[PDB]
């Protein structure tokens with residue numbers, strides 16, 4: 001009865017060897033060939049001109065927002081249903097998160113609720129691509145265009161997804177990714193900013209390397225950060241990136257298994273809706289439990305654990321947690337409902353059909 | 369003639385082994401054995417109860433200040449002569465750096481200039497142990513206690529140093545260290561906070577880990593950061609620490625060669641003064657050029673370079689660079705003088721007596 005983990009990394013390419021070179025060469029810091037190579041390759045992978053390697057997906061967002069000039073006073077629209085760093089990133093800038101409702105099916109920012117939230121202080125919108133699925137960008141871009149707003153994609157959970165022929169990371173003014181341990185591709189901890197804007201790219205690199213002038217060593221023209229990725233993180237990321245497609249394929253296999261087995265559950269869960277706008281990379285396989293259940297989402301998590309199956313609740317809405325309770329509105333209903341009923345199911349490259357079978361059997365038993 | 373670099377990581381212990389283990393077991397993110405082991409060993413090496421591993425020494429500083437509650441309106445006294453991360457860290461809290469001059473001999477915070485800088489807003493004093501030498505702690509602690517201020521040691525360059533029987537890191541309310549690539553101990557990029565106070569340590573672990581309750585996964589009681597160290601960085605760190613005494617001895621030898629051979633340069637340099645307060649670990653061997661010279665400090669660095677020898681200027685005082693020029697005062701004269709004539713010479717564990725001979729001969733050639 002081996003436990004089943006919601007996530008896990010699969011280092012099945014050149015990771016070990018590339019890490020070895022770093023070690024052998026003594027290039028373990030924030031300078032080395034893999035950083036540039038990883039940035040170049042990631043940039044190509046997304047179809048953009050620039051890729052900026054960061055220490056994590058959280059600092060990437062911060063660094064991206066600061067480079068964009070988000071600061072005190074400014075409002076950034078962010079979905080209440082998201083991972084907390086989306087909101088915190090805005091907060092670190094001294095700026096103000098303005099929460100917006102999501103779609104009840106895709107879990108993503110509802111473009112129809114944006115216009116109403118725009119004010120004289122709005123500067124940007126941060127669509128977050130939940131669970132490997134790109135928000136409906138066209139409408140979002142169109143609203144930003146109309147209001148002269150920046151669009152920053154939090155693409156943390158979406159490496160590889162596409163929207164109407166474009167890869168995540170290539171849609172807003174800039175985008176951020178995470179390579180945290182459980183991500184589609186990992187570096188253990190690591191992040192990336194993508195953009196086509198030369199000027200934003202330069203300011204990002206300037207702020208990443210402590211605010212030091214790249215053309216005047218030891219001289220610091222602005223206040224910056226230490227947000228650099230190491231050559232080792234870059235080594236692991238490059239090797240992961242080389243097998244991105246294989247990694248992508250493995251999740252699709254796992255997802256195909258859930259999808260072929262779901263009737264066993266009936267109307268007891270609603271399977272994740274796939275918008276027909278491009279590839280959904282399924283960082284996580286997310287269901288919405290039946291309101292009709294006597295049991296609670298939280299109990300269900302406890303019961304699956306008891307059956308050695310790991311699962312987690314969908315992100316608690318920002319506005320229901322202490323840091324952002326004050327940002328609550330009466331127009332965050334869908335987010336609340338998903339926060340109530342949402343359940344992330346184990347989705348990782350190493351899960352087997354038998355494991356998926358176990359997961360379904362347990363849900364069948366616990367969904368009461 | 370290979371080039372002589374000012375610093376360089378000596379990975380001549382178990383770094384490779386420990387790292388390979390992380391790769392082979394897949395533990396390459398911010399959870400794992402090495403993290404806890406490294407924190408454990410480090411806390412013991414410093415003689416304190418807690419050590420909190422972070423992704424760098426700059427975020428370490430930020431994290432510790434936030435944990436001690438530094439925020440908007442507060443003032444922290446920081447020497448103008450330091451690496452800019454010292455001041456930036458306060459800046460990130462939205463607090464105000466209050467610059468103080470240093471000793472002309474040790475390059476450290478001048479305790480005698482502290483009191484007059486204290487105001488109703490002061491919350492803390494940040495002594496920085498430059499070049500591996502601990503500031504004169506007792507007088508500084510004397511002033512702080514009298515004014516009920518916190519003390520936070522920026523111990524980035526002084527792992528291993530001691531002061532009147534105590535290791536760097538055990539002296540203030542908390543302290544920070546850097547394992548950047550050129551540091552006494554390196555993890556490539558890495559940092560650590562040390563403290564004896566249980567609650568400060570807990571709050572520090574709370575913030576480090578995205579502000580998530582260690583007791584209620586997925587729940588976020590406060591706004592935190594992503595400042596965690598990877599298991600890979602901790603693995604390197606632990607292997608470095610296992611050989612800390614050898615690393616320091618190596619530097620001692622090198623320093624000894626300097627002490628002996630520097631005679632050849634006569635009054636053309638002023639050798640680093642060493643306080644008899646405890647061990648000066650010599651992150652860098654720092655001279656101040658003779659006033660009698662006709663050459664300039666920047667020119668000597670260029671001439672050494674052309675001769676294949678790396679050196680660097682003593683840090684530029686904060687108040688003379690754009691970000692902090694607004695905090696300039698007329699009582700920062702020693703820091704300005706040191707910045708003008710200060711030169712860091714190669715100092716690292718891989719240097720031979722011959723290498724040192726070479727640096728001195730080059731200095732004999734360029735100090736005109």
Ligand SMILES: O=C(O)CCC(=O)C(=O)O
Nearest residue numbers: 209210226426451548550
């Ligand atoms: O780049 C950093 O984060 C620190 C730089 C530093 O300590 C140095 O160059 O001596």
Ligand code: NA
Nearest residue numbers: 659660661662
């Ligand atoms: Na002179």
